[PDB]
Design an enzyme around this catalytic site. Structure first.
Site, PDB file in Angstrom:
ATOM      1  N   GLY A   1       0.752  -1.248   0.000  1.00 37.86           N
ATOM      2  CA  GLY A   1       0.000   0.000   0.000  1.00 37.86           C
ATOM      3  C   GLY A   1       0.779   1.293   0.000  1.00 37.86           C
TER       4      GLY A   1
ATOM      5  N   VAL B   1       2.392   4.813   1.751  1.00 33.45           N
ATOM      6  CA  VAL B   1       3.156   5.308   2.880  1.00 33.45           C
ATOM      7  C   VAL B   1       2.997   6.828   2.920  1.00 33.45           C
ATOM      8  CG1 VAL B   1       5.386   5.328   4.094  1.00 33.45           C
ATOM      9  CG2 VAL B   1       4.769   3.361   2.669  1.00 33.45           C
TER      10      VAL B   1
ATOM     11  N   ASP C   1      16.752  -9.449   1.850  1.00 32.81           N
ATOM     12  CA  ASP C   1      16.522  -8.388   0.866  1.00 32.81           C
ATOM     13  C   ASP C   1      17.256  -7.086   1.266  1.00 32.81           C
ATOM     14  OD1 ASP C   1      13.583  -6.952  -0.879  1.00 32.81           O
ATOM     15  OD2 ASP C   1      15.601  -7.447  -1.608  1.00 32.81           O
TER      16      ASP C   1
HETATM   17  O1  LIG Z   1      10.331   7.392   6.972  1.00 32.82           O
HETATM   18  C1  LIG Z   1      10.418   6.897   5.859  1.00 32.82           C
HETATM   19  C2  LIG Z   1       9.846   5.535   5.646  1.00 32.82           C
HETATM   20  C3  LIG Z   1       9.281   4.980   4.516  1.00 32.82           C
HETATM   21  C4  LIG Z   1       8.924   3.638   4.855  1.00 32.82           C
HETATM   22  C5  LIG Z   1       8.385   2.669   3.994  1.00 32.82           C
HETATM   23  N1  LIG Z   1       8.739   2.504   2.700  1.00 32.82           N
HETATM   24  N2  LIG Z   1       8.157   1.422   2.116  1.00 32.82           N
HETATM   25  C6  LIG Z   1       7.410   0.872   3.059  1.00 32.82           C
HETATM   26  C7  LIG Z   1       7.421   1.540   4.290  1.00 32.82           C
HETATM   27  C8  LIG Z   1       6.890   1.192   5.627  1.00 32.82           C
HETATM   28  C9  LIG Z   1       6.417   2.203   6.465  1.00 32.82           C
HETATM   29  C10 LIG Z   1       5.857   1.861   7.677  1.00 32.82           C
HETATM   30 CL1  LIG Z   1       5.355   3.144   8.753  1.00 32.82          CL
HETATM   31  C11 LIG Z   1       5.710   0.555   8.076  1.00 32.82           C
HETATM   32  C12 LIG Z   1       6.140  -0.434   7.213  1.00 32.82           C
HETATM   33 CL2  LIG Z   1       5.908  -2.106   7.649  1.00 32.82          CL
HETATM   34  C13 LIG Z   1       6.731  -0.138   6.000  1.00 32.82           C
HETATM   35  C14 LIG Z   1       9.272   3.485   6.180  1.00 32.82           C
HETATM   36  N3  LIG Z   1       9.822   4.618   6.676  1.00 32.82           N
HETATM   37  N4  LIG Z   1      11.151   7.466   4.861  1.00 32.82           N
HETATM   38  C15 LIG Z   1      11.411   7.001   3.489  1.00 32.82           C
HETATM   39  C16 LIG Z   1      12.837   7.303   3.103  1.00 32.82           C
HETATM   40  O2  LIG Z   1      13.129   8.707   3.100  1.00 32.82           O
HETATM   41  C17 LIG Z   1      12.167   9.454   3.847  1.00 32.82           C
HETATM   42  C18 LIG Z   1      11.780   8.769   5.133  1.00 32.82           C
END
Ligand SMILES: O=C(c1cc(-c2[nH]ncc2-c2cc(Cl)cc(Cl)c2)c[nH]1)N1CCOCC1
EC number: 2.7.11.24
Length: 332
Positions: A24, A26, A130
């Site tokens: 999904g 973010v 991964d």
């Molecule tokens: O804080 C995040 C962040 C993104 C993600 C994320 N990316 N894809 C999936 C998710 C993710 C986010 C959450 Cl909050 C929970 C889980 Cl299980 C996965 C997690 N933290 N970011 C992304 C990188 O640069 C800016 C800051």
């Protein structure tokens, strides 16, 4: 319900789109209890969601991302979407490497934290499988957290053998050479290879083995390591995999100091040990932590291990996700 449909109740407001995860969307949101912005993933690809929730709730480590909260309907009948809340990070190593040159001090610190987090993961008998720069989160002070346990598994080195050209799920560029030959990626040595790839990438701001397809990945690896030795080939019993390697023209080893002319000599010695073709001869996480390149940080009493080894139809899957997320319900 808050829209971006992201109903994270009244606690989380002022929603901003970050990107799109596997299951999904973010977003960043303002936590009205802790008075800080947080990251929220909406989950609406099912099995990976439960596995990752289970692992992240069990693990507690400074270099592994934790779950702050889980939002979902109070009943199984009403549950549709699941929201996972985490600390908002400043960036990830993928975004950093796209625009920023890393000093030797930053490479050294990032590598140390990766291995410190990986030591705990492996101590729980878990494989991440991964590891790549986009799965390494960073805050404004360069503190690093490993994320994305979507492909993680319990180590099973006795059932690691498979035939030649077995399909693999993890990101192509960070796959160890044995995956394309005779391995299911059920051993710890698979994660060390990915860390070695990450180190090479931090040294030059480019992926070391950018294979375009499944078998191109192997020819990229051998184009730098050179043809495997007779000894290393003898370890491969699978005839199709060994004969494929024997059919290739001889390839010379590319010296690490030729590929990375500005790298620290100790960093290259550790890189060499991580990017060892033979998985049995490849350095283990604790030896990598003890390597002279990381001497400034090495402290095994401050590198915790897990307390216990970790162990694991559509209706049952939904019910298990409901059961695993019950601790965050406001009725407690
Ligand atoms: O804080 C995040 C962040 C993104 C993600 C994320 N990316 N894809 C999936 C998710 C993710 C986010 C959450 Cl909050 C929970 C889980 Cl299980 C996965 C997690 N933290 N970011 C992304 C990188 O640069 C800016 C800051």
């Amino acid at each position: 319900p808050e829209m971006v449909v992201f109903d994270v109740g009244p606690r989380y407001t002022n929603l901003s789109y970050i990107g799109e995860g596997a299951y999904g969307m973010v977003c960043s949101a303002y936590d009205n209890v802790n008075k800080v912005r947080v990251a929220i993933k909406k989950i609406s690809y099912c099995q990976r969601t439960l596995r990752e929730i289970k692992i992240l709730l069990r693990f507690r480590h400074e270099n592994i991302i934790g779950i702050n909260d889980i939002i979902r309907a109070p009943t199984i009948e009403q549950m549709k979407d699941v929201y996972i809340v985490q600390d908002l990070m400043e960036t990830d190593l993928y975004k950093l490497l796209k625009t920023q040159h890393l000093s030797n001090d930053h490479i050294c610190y990032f590598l140390y934290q990766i291995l410190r987090g990986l030591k705990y993961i492996h101590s729980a008998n878990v494989l991440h499988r991964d590891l790549k720069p986009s799965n390494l989160l960073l805050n404004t002070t360069c503190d690093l957290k490993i994320c994305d346990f979507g492909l993680a598994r319990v180590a099973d080195p006795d059932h690691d053998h498979t035939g030649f050209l077995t399909e693999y799920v993890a990101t192509r560029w960070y796959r160890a050479p044995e995956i394309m030959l005779n391995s299911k990626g059920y051993t710890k040595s698979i994660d060390i290879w990915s860390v070695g790839c990450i180190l090479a990438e931090m040294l030059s701001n480019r992926p070391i083995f950018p294979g375009k397809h499944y078998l191109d990945q192997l020819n990229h690896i051998l184009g730098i390591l050179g043809s495997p030795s007779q000894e290393d080939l003898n370890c491969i019993i699978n005839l199709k995999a060994r004969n494929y390697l024997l059919s290739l023209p001889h390839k010379n080893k590319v010296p690490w100091n030729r590929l990375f002319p500005n790298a620290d000599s100790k960093a290259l010695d550790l890189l060499d040990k991580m990017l060892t073709f033979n998985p049995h001869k490849r350095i283990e996480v604790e030896q990598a932590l003890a390597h002279p390149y990381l001497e400034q940080y090495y402290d095994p009493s401050d590198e915790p291990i897990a307390e216990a080894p970790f162990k694991f139809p559509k209706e049952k899957l939904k019910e298990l996700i409901f059961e695993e997320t019950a601790r965050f319900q406001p009725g407690y």
